[PDB]
RNA sequence: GGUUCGUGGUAGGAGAGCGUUCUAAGGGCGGUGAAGUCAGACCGGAAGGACUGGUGGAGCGCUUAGAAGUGAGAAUGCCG
RNA sequence: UACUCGGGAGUCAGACUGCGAGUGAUAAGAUCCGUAGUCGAAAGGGAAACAGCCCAGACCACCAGUUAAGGUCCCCAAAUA
RNA sequence: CCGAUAGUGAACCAGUACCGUGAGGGAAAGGUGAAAAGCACCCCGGAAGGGGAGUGAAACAGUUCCUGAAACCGUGUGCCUACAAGUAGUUAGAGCCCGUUAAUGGGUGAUAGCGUGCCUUUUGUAGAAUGAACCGGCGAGUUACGAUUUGUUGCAAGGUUAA
């Protein structure tokens, strides 16, 4: 329940490999022209589908 | 200084086709393990594979003597408790004439990363007839 | 008067690091781990300068042998005939025309044959 | 011509490891798509990186009159900054200490 | 000559200091052998 | 056209226009160097001696005298206090072989 | 300068030395860049000593003696 | 090499192996003596590994040679003598 | 004699802060620059903080600010690495990449042989016996007065003064 040996560094950066943070999937506006995440609400020109929420 | 070292490469490797019929298994296979080995050539360099193709072929016919047909076991453990398995010989023989003559020849071979290479470069048949007529093998004659 | 120890421990402690250069890990960043880390290498180097001596007359033979070998001869008995006439090339040299200029060594296998036959 | 722009932020209270995850997604990309990332990235530490990103790209334009649609980010890294010492009171009389850690955060904007 | 003097050859010694290092001879025990009465501080016994 | 020849207690194949490396010898840069001892004579024919070839000999300029890179020999023995350093740089001299007799 | 015999080593005995701070005399270098710090593929049988280049921005070596708060990898050592 | 006089010591927990005895059960890697060796304070080669068994005592360097114990079918140098 | 872990506990609003019911215990903390000439003005930002401009010999001297080592944390890149059993090295060694205090040079290394950390305490420790998370500073035979022995110097049947 204690570490019996200390971590080296190579074996502390390989755990590391999969605490990574994936990329946003956002696209560009039809509208506006900018970009957005997919189906959701565009937060700059507020349109949905085409149509002004 | 000045010593002779080859390179990967450098060396021509053959082809042979070895009968292994009436020898003994432990004659036999201490013939080859040098020619994998590539000791018999004055370009001998230890870190490097210089050695050659070894085919194997009438190896159900290979020789047992005294009563090892019978007397002689085969263990096998499978990590599990209790899963040790155990084969003859004589039985192997006849049923998987191939895996007799590489057990007993991987044995005879250095126990590194270089020995599990030469291991990939035997070829044995229980039959008589092999499928590398392509790379065109000599016939070799033991001493 | 006061001898404050600076500017020694230091210059001392650093010479030790740069000798662990190329090392995995703290063996070359921390000095007591590359301190017993040069040591040893020292030990080990010390006694491999004795086994290279060794290991090379290993590979000479071994060579030698496999030429003899072509000429219906061992290295035990192409050894003897070489002696026994008189011939004192050492393994280094043979080894070397075994491999080199192979012509050559035919030349005093024969010499080493006709010795052992009167 | 000096074709590079920087702007750094300095002991920003965001603690380091916490803030080389979000720059790890906006290093090589263009500008106009880092901006979108730190945008819609629900991490604390995307409104502190998007200031530096956009502080860099305002004076890559006008102290050096470059164009804002070929920058790139050509270099993002989180450093260490002072980090102030705190204690949090644990059982039995016993106190454990608590690291409260600082930043300072570096983009580089240039052409591509 | 105040910058050449040179005392009586023989007349003056160096010292021996004990306890700095193993190169000496005189290092990790100083001298004194392993775990006595005679290995304290201040230890030993009287004259007689 | 090569030969074999006998100096420092070792032997060394030797060829024309070669430079090589022996153990200390005496004899001023410039000077000329002549061996005895040749045990080998190849090419184009051979010449096995018994143990040395009748009547042969090779020459070579000195070139260079001088001492090796330098070394450190180190030894301790765990657990007993015990260590030992030294340097070491062992002397040579560089030839020029001009011809083989 | 030769000849002969030697040259594993714990506790321990004997000898010769390296390096640090300060003092005295002689002789020196330094804003055309001192000490310190960083790097290097140089020198000596060891402890160790130079040289070149970057940083630094004002003190420091050398020779012969003298005197010591005299050399750390370990003390469940003290402090950061 | 011995001996005498003088300055400085450390040591007074020993271990196994062969031989000769006691205690023990003609047990013990037991215990206690006499005698020789090695380790302690001894690296190197052989007993697979293996302080005490066999050979043999490391000033340094060499890509030189002859031997000791032990070995010469392959792993692994040397006789499928 | 010391030179900011030293020298007074205290070179700085120190017997202070803090701890205890109380008697009492008791710290840490020096250095911009010759001169504040301590950054007018512009740009991003709520601000903090930056990039220019300017002062200055120097701003990589910008309000723990001379110098700025090591542990520790990062970015870029030359060589190697996903069939391999490892006290991490050493000896042999191809391939690839460089070019020095110029000399049988530098970096990395597929593969092959050999190889069970340092200290202490022990008959005997790789030891599953003890100590150390790592780096840096500090940390242990000294002095006074007497005894004895060796070396050196002066005088010598004499030598030498103490207060
Ligand atoms: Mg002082
Ligand atoms: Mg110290
Ligand atoms: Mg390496
Ligand atoms: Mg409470
Ligand atoms: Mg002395
Ligand atoms: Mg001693
Ligand atoms: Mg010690
Ligand atoms: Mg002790
Ligand atoms: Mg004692
Ligand atoms: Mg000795
Ligand atoms: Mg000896
Ligand atoms: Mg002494
Ligand atoms: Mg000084
Ligand atoms: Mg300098
Ligand atoms: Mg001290
Ligand atoms: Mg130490
Ligand atoms: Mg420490
Ligand atoms: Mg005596
Ligand atoms: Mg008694
Ligand atoms: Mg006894
Ligand atoms: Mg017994
Ligand atoms: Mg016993
Ligand atoms: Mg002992
Ligand atoms: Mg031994
Ligand atoms: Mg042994
Ligand atoms: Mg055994
Ligand atoms: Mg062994
Ligand atoms: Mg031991
Ligand atoms: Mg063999
Ligand atoms: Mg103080
Ligand atoms: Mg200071
Ligand atoms: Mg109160
Ligand atoms: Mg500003
Ligand atoms: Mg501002
Ligand atoms: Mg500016
Ligand atoms: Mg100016
Ligand atoms: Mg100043
Ligand atoms: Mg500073
Ligand atoms: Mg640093
Ligand atoms: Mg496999
Ligand atoms: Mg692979
Ligand atoms: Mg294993
Ligand atoms: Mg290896
Ligand atoms: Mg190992
Ligand atoms: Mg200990
Ligand atoms: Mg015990
Ligand atoms: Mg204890
Ligand atoms: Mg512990
Ligand atoms: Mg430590
Ligand atoms: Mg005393
Ligand atoms: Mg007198
Ligand atoms: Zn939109």
New interface residues.
Partial sequence: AVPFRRTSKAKKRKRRTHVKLQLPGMNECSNCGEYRLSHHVCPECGQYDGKDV | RTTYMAKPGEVERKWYVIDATGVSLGRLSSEVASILRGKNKPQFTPHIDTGDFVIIINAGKIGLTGKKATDKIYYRHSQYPGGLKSRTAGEMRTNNPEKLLELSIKGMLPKNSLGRQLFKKLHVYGGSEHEHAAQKPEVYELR | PRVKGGTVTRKRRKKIVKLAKGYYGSKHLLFKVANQAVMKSYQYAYRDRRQKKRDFRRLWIARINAAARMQDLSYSKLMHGLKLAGIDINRKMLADLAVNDIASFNTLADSAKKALAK | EVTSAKAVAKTVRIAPRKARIVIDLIRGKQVGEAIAILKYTPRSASPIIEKVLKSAIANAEHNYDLDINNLVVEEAFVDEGPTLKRFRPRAQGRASAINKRTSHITVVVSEV | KLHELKPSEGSRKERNRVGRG??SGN??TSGRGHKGQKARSGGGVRLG | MYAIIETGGKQIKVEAGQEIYVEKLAGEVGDVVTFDKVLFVGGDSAKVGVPFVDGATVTAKVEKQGRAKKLTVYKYKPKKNYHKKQGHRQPYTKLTIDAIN
């Fill in positions: 193993t190169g290092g990790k």
